[PDB]
Design a protein around this ligand. Structure first.
Ligand code: HEM
Ligand code: HEM
Ligand SMILES: Cc1cc(N)nc(C[C@@H]2CNC[C@@H]2OCCN[C@H]2C[C@@H]2c2cccc(F)c2)c1
Ligand SMILES: Cc1cc(N)nc(C[C@@H]2CNC[C@@H]2OCCN[C@H]2C[C@@H]2c2cccc(F)c2)c1
Ligand SMILES: C[C@H](O)[C@H](O)[C@H]1CNc2nc(N)[nH]c(=O)c2N1
Ligand SMILES: C[C@H](O)[C@H](O)[C@H]1CNc2nc(N)[nH]c(=O)c2N1
Ligand SMILES: [Zn+2]
Lengths: 411, 407
């Protein structure tokens, strides 16, 4: 069966056959669409089919499907599963797997880059101090003095679910949030709870507006341990505006390296609960979301005040005006400092070319419109006009519950 | 079976039970989400009628009452013998208001209970349709103090005697493809304009020519009528700060009036049911003015503002977009023509959603349509989870008539 998607700006029609390989469920039914809902230990029984599906995909990709090497590997994994109840990936399979989880990530606008991913194999890691060392090396490699390189570091897979590796931070680099007695927040409101955990675990908080948080790292199901990323490894950009000289005195800065650390990587039924990955920012993530969400730095008012915009009516579009200026400043600042960043026009145009390519060579490209369309200037980007099909392919990145809710404290 | 929706800005959680009354299909399966796709007999009619009359009698607190059972009986008898039935005026009004209430793509539904319903089921000719439409246009416009209205022409019978407004909206601008190779006017209407010309319209061949109505009564060939120019309230677009803005020569009409949809009430199908409200400013300033396949004016405006157009990362498109939208709002407000900005409309929709959750058990909503086409995340709807499902009475999209019609 075939499914068509149309682009309402170009009239280009694409045909999806790849959705036929989709396994997992979406949350939607014939009677309800859950397209805007944010969140809509395995047996041997469920594991060998998943391993087999994966190895079939891997061997096809290398043009060796049905070969002796393919058949031998199937047998070897079969025997390993029956005897040890899990299995180990070869390095070449782990690489393929992590690249494909990115390629398959329907919420990711940056996927034109998927085949260029540095995979660091950290499956020999055993302790949190070892996790710390792996993560520093990741940060230093990815940062590359501002010439950012995509990378992922993969710690040991899940076993009984009692010995999990986890990075408790949601990203490797983020700013502390501090809830004040008067109810106001100092720093980033998104990280208040995690900041309190750090403090409880013994972190000495500087208590400013941009304190880089410490890593809280759990190895082998043990209680997590605190480490401070060497400040010389944390590249930051002070935010200034090309025309407005008062913009610098707002005191804003942001870090260069967006590094997601709370997701679960599934490859061939194995679960990598600690697999921090990083790319580079699209400007709007910082300028629109981090700075202007009401629940984050929330700087719209202060900027618009300083721009002397008419603020007595929403219909002057003061918020919209201030928003564009803040986003100009982020992009200017990163570019001026030679730190990799992409604007939302370039990123979305690249995504559309990626998606058309994928339709031709792969038969589809699952995409989540709700997430791919940027949070400002939606319809002046070509993705707004593009119909997309959302479905779940493996290998995949999945959300997992924050570890403080599930962790069995050892003491 | 009971579902939760969370607002990620406010942490407020709502529980949806209303979706269990949904019947029609979404196009989504457990394996594929089609959320971003624009278009995803006697026996069949009685359950549809029953479903509707039940909700109606419930709404007036008379469910299971003598008057309820009596109407159910009368409608059954009328279907059995005539193969259809006629709605009482009260039912027609209730059904139209509820088709709006159920419109998952409509951000303006806080307004749903204030809809003036014009019953045009006695209409028999295209000239009669023109009369009803001019009256609708004048009533809804109200000298710029706009009032929501729908005008409901006779229901489908054997489907070869359909009433249709061929126009996609009552008021739109013509588009003409040029020897230059480009498009003069609104590129969205090039096909309809040619059909108007080929049926006899004398086009002024300008950038902002109000299209004629093409009206089809009783399945006949459609006929042309010009809406009295004095009933079409238009707004010249100027800017509060930029004096050069007026020289682009832009204008738009005050009355958004959708006229190509099908109203389904209790299984009956109203194929001509033009309706109208008032604009959210982004529809004109973002979509009508700045879509690449529409008036596509970003480049001209950016140039007049002398922005750096060498690189996308200067955000020249984004700056010009805001200014265009400030101008649309300023112009309508100055000329005292009802308009709503996207901040105000989305704030009201969150309030409406909360009312609908507490009072009705939910509110079907299509996030892809509800979130405005600019500044998405600085409006509260961006952070609001929405469940999309189909309730009846409903408005449904129907295919352009020129494909269906035989002359
Ligand atoms: C290289 C440049 C990249 C850019 C510009 C980019 C852009 C983005 C953006 C804007 C989002 C939505 C983020 C949000 O709103 O929170 C996203 C999501 C995501 N991307 Fe990328 N991305 C890049 C690289 C990567 C890499 C290297 C990976 C993995 C190897 C990846 C996997 C993901 C996943 C799994 C999501 C969904 C995140 C979630 O559910 O929280 N991306 N991407
Ligand atoms: C009172 C002021 C109103 C406002 C501000 C408003 C707002 C909007 C907006 C912005 C859209 C999206 C339009 C588009 O992007 O093409 C829309 C869609 C829609 N609205 Fe409203 N609306 C109003 C009144 C009405 C009325 C009176 C009705 C019916 C009686 C209605 C029913 C619909 C329907 C069925 C759609 C989807 C149209 C389609 O699929 O093309 N609305 N509304
Ligand atoms: C409930 C929930 C579910 C889910 N799947 N993700 C989240 C995280 C939510 C989703 N938007 C806000 C918060 O993420 C902030 C982190 N953004 C980093 C991903 C972007 C990024 C950008 C560029 C390269 C990358 F590798 C990564 C929350
Ligand atoms: C393929 C297709 C399907 C569909 N359901 N609608 C369309 C119409 C497409 C969808 N967005 C653009 C085009 O409508 C422009 C009409 N805008 C008027 C509706 C808005 C409006 C606004 C305020 C009050 C109202 F009563 C009505 C096209
Ligand atoms: C409720 C809604 O799904 C939610 O706010 C989404 C909308 N789109 C998004 N898109 C991106 N890229 N990131 C997000 O966090 C969100 N949040
Ligand atoms: C493909 C995508 O569904 C399409 O471009 C949609 C997106 N959201 C929209 N939202 C509104 N209000 N109106 C539209 O016409 C559209 N177009
Ligand atoms: Zn869906």
């Amino acid at each position: 069966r075939f499914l068509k998607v149309k682009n309402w700006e170009t009239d280009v029609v694409l045909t999806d056959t790849l959705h036929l390989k989709s396994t997992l469920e979406t949350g939607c039914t014939e009677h309800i669409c859950m397209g805007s809902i944010m969140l809509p230990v395995r047996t041997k029984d469920q594991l060998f089919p998943l391993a087999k599906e994966f190895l079939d995909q891997y061997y096809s990709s290398i043009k060796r499907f049905g070969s002796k090497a393919h058949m031998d590997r199937l047998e070897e994994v079969n025997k390993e599963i029956e005897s040890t109840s899990t299995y180990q990936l070869k390095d070449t399979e782990l690489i393929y797997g992590a690249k494909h989880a990115w390629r398959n990530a329907s919420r990711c606008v940056g996927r034109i880059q998927w085949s260029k991913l540095q995979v660091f194999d950290a499956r020999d890691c055993t302790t949190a101090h070892g996790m710390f060392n792996y993560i520093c090396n990741h940060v230093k490699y990815a940062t590359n003095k501002g010439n950012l390189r995509s990378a992922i570091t993969i710690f040991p897979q899940r076993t009984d679910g009692k010995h999990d590796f986890r990075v408790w931070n949601s990203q490797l680099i983020r700013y502390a949030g501090y809830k004040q007695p008067d109810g106001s927040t100092l720093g980033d409101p998104a990280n208040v709870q995690f900041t309190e955990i750090c403090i409880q675990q013994g972190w000495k908080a500087p208590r400013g507006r941009f304190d880089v948080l410490p890593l809280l790292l759990q190895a082998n199901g043990n209680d997590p341990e605190l480490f401070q990323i060497p400040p010389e490894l944390v590249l930051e950009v002070p935010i200034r505006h090309p025309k407005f000289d008062w913009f610098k005195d707002l005191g804003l800065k942001w870090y260069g390296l967006p590094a997601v650390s709370n997701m679960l990587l599934e490859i061939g039924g194995l679960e990598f609960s600690a697999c921090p990955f990083s790319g580079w920012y699209m400007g709007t993530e910082i300028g629109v979301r981090d700075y202007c969400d009401n629940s984050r730095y929330n700087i719209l008012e202060e900027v618009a005040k300083k721009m002397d915009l008419d603020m007595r009516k929403t219909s002057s579009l003061w918020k919209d005006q201030a928003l564009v200026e803040i986003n100009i400043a982020v992009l200017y600042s990163f570019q001026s400092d030679k730190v990799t960043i992409v604007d939302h026009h370039s990123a979305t145009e690249s995504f559309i070319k990626h998606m058309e390519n994928e339709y031709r060579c792969r038969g589809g490209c699952p995409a989540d419109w709700v997430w791919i369309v940027p949070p400002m200037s939606g319809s002046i980007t070509p993705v707004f006009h593009q119909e997309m099909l959302n479905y779940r392919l493996t290998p995949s990145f999945e959300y997992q519950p924050d570890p403080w809710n599930t962790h069995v404290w050892k003491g």
